[PDB]
């Protein structure tokens, strides 16, 4: 019956931060495990 939200910038900032963290984790996912290669 209430609790209205009129702000959207923090949500977009958090979404962008989560996307950047996921991209970083996917980029560093290659060099992991005993069967991994090296980067140049």
């Amino acid at each position: 019956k209430g609790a209205y939200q009129d702000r959207d910038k923090p949500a977009q900032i958090r979404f962008s931060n989560i996307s950047a963290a996921k991209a970083v984790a996917d980029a560093i996912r290659t060099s992991l495990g005993p069967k991994g290669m090296d980067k140049m």
């Binding site: 290669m37 090296d38 980067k39």
Partner: protein, 40 residues
Amino acid sequence: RDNKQAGVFEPTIVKVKSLKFATEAAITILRIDDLIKLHP
């Protein structure tokens, strides 16, 4: 021809070192799968 008689005469340490260097170069290069070139 005869070769071993008096034609060609080469040592073995040079060939061993060359083979070891070639193996090390083939090992240190095959473990590469990504390159990151930064802009100056």
